[PDB]
């Protein structure tokens, strides 16, 4: 098929009693979730026999070049889908057990230290919100992804690199930093650069507001789900009637959100 399903359920409530009284009972609610696959991504190349007979071989180079684009597109789609989950509003039927998606802002400043302080404050707010949801015991499993700009800005903060406060964390000269608010930091170059469309489909379009979010925190198990109908494959065949050869590579998959309650995004505002 081209769909998958996952179930959802609520919680219960406690009450009190005295001798001679009867116990009361309450109902429990439930819902569902579905994802679908809609698009095939490919790349093709053709050549003639006569040209192939009078030139050095070059098929290996093109074969090697084919997969880099696939990997880049996969990573870009992953990040784009992570970013978009900052606007969900939980339905009232699951309110006690499910929450909303969050977003926090950092104000641009001429000085770099103040900008870093604002960013760290937003991250702290997010971490406190996460801790309030009984998730504080698993902060060793969360991950923080920052674009190179934010990664460079983080080293300019008055702390996180100063031995007086954060001994053994980072080094300014060597461009190194390991942790913030108890969570790891990872640098990625796959963040979107400008508004536009994507080959995957219409669910991956990005506007000006989306591009401003250059920092996100998520759980690598309970946040996203990937649905796959055809893994990446290649096949080179000859077209005997036409005197030529062809090479193809194609795949079919998609990405969707599972629990937007375990992530948040930080937004930079009033940029030049």
């Amino acid at each position: 098929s081209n769909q998958a399903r996952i179930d959802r359920m609520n919680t219960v409530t406690i009450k009190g009693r005295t001798p001679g009284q009867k116990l009361d009972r309450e109902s429990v609610k439930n819902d569902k979730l579905v994802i679908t696959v809609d698009t095939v991504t490919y790349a093709s190349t053709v050549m003639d026999w006569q040209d192939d007979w009078t030139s050095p071989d070059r098929w290996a180079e093109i074969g090697a070049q084919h997969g880099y684009q696939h990997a880049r597109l996969f990573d870009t789609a992953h990040l784009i889908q992570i970013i978009k989950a900052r606007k969900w509003i939980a339905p009232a039927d699951l309110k006690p057990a499910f929450f909303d998606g969050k977003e926090y802002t950092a104000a641009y400043n001429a000085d770099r230290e103040l900008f870093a302080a604002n960013i760290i404050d937003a991250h702290r707010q997010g971490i406190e919100e996460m801790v309030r949801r009984d998730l504080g015991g698993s902060l060793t499993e969360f991950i923080t992804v920052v674009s190179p700009y934010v990664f460079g800005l983080l080293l300019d903060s008055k702390k996180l690199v100063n031995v007086d406060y954060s001994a053994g964390n980072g080094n300014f000269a060597e461009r190194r930093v390991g942790m913030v608010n108890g969570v790891r930091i990872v640098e990625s170059a796959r963040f979107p650069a400008a508004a536009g469309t994507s080959p995957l489909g219409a669910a991956f379009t990005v506007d000006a507001d989306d591009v401003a979010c250059q920092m996100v925190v998520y759980h690598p198990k309970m946040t996203l789900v990937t649905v796959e109908a055809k893994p990446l494959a290649t096949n080179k065949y000859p077209d005997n009637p036409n005197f030529s050869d062809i090479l193809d590579s194609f795949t079919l998959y998609t990405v969707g959100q599972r629990r937007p309650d375990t992530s948040f995004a930080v937004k930079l505002t009033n940029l030049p």
Binding site: V34, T36, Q81, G256
Partner: protein, 61 residues
Amino acid sequence: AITTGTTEAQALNMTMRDAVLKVAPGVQQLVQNSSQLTAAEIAIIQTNITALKAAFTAAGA
């Protein structure tokens, strides 16, 4: 009023049935996730609902 037992009634009912299943999956995505809430996608749902209304009117429901 809805009618059955004739070719024209069957054709109208078939069209009305087929018009509903197009709207059916859109509403679920409208509320289950935030990945498909862009302004460009709600336009398709709007046209689907507009066609569903015309189908209802034609069928006489």
